[PDB]
Amino acid sequence: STDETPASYNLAVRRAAPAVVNVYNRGLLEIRTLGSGVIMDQRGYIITNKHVINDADQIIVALQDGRVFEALLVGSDSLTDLAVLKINATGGLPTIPINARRVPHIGDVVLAIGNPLGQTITQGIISATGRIGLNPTGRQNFLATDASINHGNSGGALVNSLGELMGINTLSPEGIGFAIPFQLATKIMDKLIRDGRVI
Amino acid sequence: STDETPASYNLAVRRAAPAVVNVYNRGLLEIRTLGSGVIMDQRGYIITNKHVINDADQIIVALQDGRVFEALLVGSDSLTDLAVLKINATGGLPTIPINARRVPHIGDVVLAIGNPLGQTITQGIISATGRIGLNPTGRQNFLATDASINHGNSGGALVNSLGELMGINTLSPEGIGFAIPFQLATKIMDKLIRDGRVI
Amino acid sequence: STDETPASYNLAVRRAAPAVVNVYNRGLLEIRTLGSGVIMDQRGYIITNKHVINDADQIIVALQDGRVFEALLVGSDSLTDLAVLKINATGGLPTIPINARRVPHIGDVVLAIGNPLGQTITQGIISATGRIGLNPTGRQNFLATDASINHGNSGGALVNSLGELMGINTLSPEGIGFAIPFQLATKIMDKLIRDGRVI
């Protein structure tokens, strides 16, 4: 036992966990814990759930390395219950690994990450994929997983054994949790970033 | 990340999932979703739970490849809450992989498969094995697992990382799901097939 | 399929499971099932939860190999809800593998073991680690995991793929179970053993 190594997905945790952050409100002083989020790129854009930031007077984001920024709401999307925040990027931002070439397969191992107790991670697999409810996008709508999904990780990341982003944990039929495919999450972010610059 | 491969049990899914089917009723027109089932052999025999087909006027079975047959009830077994259906086998039927030589061990990884949301798969391990309640068979009665078992997969298959059949998800003490060992399920099917041909 | 081998953690089960035992009370005759415990060393010391043995007139311990001893309460610790029992060690006692050099990492695979249905094992990962509530020890207080933790395994062991002891399942915020790090459990046991010899 002493010589060998335990089976673990701590690799994926090292790679993707730094990029997952907390999201707070700071009304007035009251500092509430809203939920989780995911740093997407060096520009300082972050994805989170719309419900998390719905009634937010002041939004604050806290990284696992100790840094704390104030974020501004770039824009949200009710249908997918997503929202994009923006923060000033001091030199060095941890970003969520993304592989646009990777094709998620049913059965894949996935870790769910978010802060309820500090950062927390649960393990499951991709239970199913397809489209659900109103699907204006025309593209695959949901991603199901038996990894525990709750408020504590709602808005957080869902990643494979490699650490690559598979989806965004969301709340929008028991024992199963849902995430928004990273391909759809990417597209929605871009359209929210671009259409945020509009009269 | 781009080069390597994610840890996954999609192999087992490819092999065993095609064989797991939906089971409906078609009263009158009302088409209800009853539960799941498992194609066992080329002859077109299918195992499912007795509760699934208890009050069924007309039974219908739908494969993942798009085909839809009408099934007839070969016979059921109250003690194990199993039931065997029969369908006309057009050329080419997907059947559930079975290894009569394989000995299930506690700790083994297992996937639970069934259609609640479309086909769905959850992951767990064999938590325990033994005999429970009235045991006329004299042989091992149950197989416990922490893979989520629910109505949506009740009657579906339980398989290992290889795809080999370990048991039949059933409903007949919290956080744990149950399946009927494939060795017992086989024997019960045969006796229901044979004793179905009786005056 | 026939040639290959299923993915399994039965190795860890073989190594650590024999050491996990049942704990009963024997009032008067009534024999109640209290919970689970863990043989720690050849001297015959066993760890269990304090709630398990709180109102115990006579304590009995049953191994998976068939042997049955009477245990005496060495002492307990309210803060960590632990308790140490002592039994006469006939030649040959199964003890829980321990690696004082092993550093638990988040994401590690872990099996939870205890007797509710006979011995049962569930699989999860180390979700988180840190310190919680009143922390007089100054050292890391808790270990979180998404392996199912319940009364049936409360007091039982939590081990990695190797079988090495990671913690003691305990009851002292949903979907997540807790265990006491084995490094803290060791220290508490020793202090209870030593300070048990006191006027």
UniProtKB/Swiss-Prot annotation, chains A, B, C:
A GO cellular component term found in this entry reads:
outer membrane-bounded periplasmic space
Catalytic activity reads: Acts on substrates that are at least partially unfolded. The cleavage site P1 residue is normally between a pair of hydrophobic residues, such as Val-|-Val
The annotated active site, in chain numbering, is H51 (charge relay system), D81 (charge relay system), S154 (charge relay system)
Subcellular localization is given as:
Cell inner membrane
Q: What is the effect of changing S154A?
A: Does not restore RseA degradation in a degS disruption. Loss of RseA degradation
Q: Consequence of mutating K187D? A: Increases the basal rate of RseA cleavage 3-fold, acts synergistically with an rseB disruption
> Per the UniProt record, which EC number(s) apply here?
3.4.21.107
Q: How does it sit in the membrane?
A: Single-pass membrane protein
> What GO terms in the biological process aspect are recorded for it?
cellular response to misfolded protein; proteolysis
Keywords, comma-separated and alphabetical: Cell inner membrane, Cell membrane, Hydrolase, Membrane, Protease, Serine protease, Transmembrane, Transmembrane helix
Activity control, as annotated, is: Allosterically activated by the C-terminus of exposed OMP peptides (consensus Tyr-X-Phe-COOH); cleavage only occurs in the presence of peptides. Inhibited when RseB is bound to RseA.
Annotated residues that bind substrate are located at T137
Q: What happens when the gene is disrupted?
A: Small, slowly growing colonies. 5-fold decrease in basal sigma-E (RpoE) activity, loss of regular growth regulation of sigma-E. No proteolysis of full-length RseA.
Periplasmic domain ranges by topology: 1-199
Q: What is known of its domains?
A: The PDZ domain probably binds peptides ending with C-terminal Tyr-X-Phe sequences, which activates proteolysis. In the absence of OMP peptides the PDZ domain inhibits peptidase activity.
Query: What family, per the record?
Result: Belongs to the peptidase S1C family.
Write out the function statement from the record: A site-1 protease (S1P) that cleaves the peptide bond between 'Val-148' and 'Ser-149' in RseA. Part of a regulated intramembrane proteolysis (RIP) cascade. When heat shock or other environmental stresses disrupt protein folding in the periplasm, DegS senses the accumulation of unassembled outer membrane porins (OMP) and then initiates RseA (anti sigma-E factor) degradation by cleaving its periplasmic domain, making it a substrate for subsequent cleavage by RseP.
Q: How does it assemble?
A: Homotrimer.
The identity of this protein, by name, is: Serine endoprotease DegS
Q: Where does this protein come from, organism-wise?
A: Escherichia coli (strain K12)
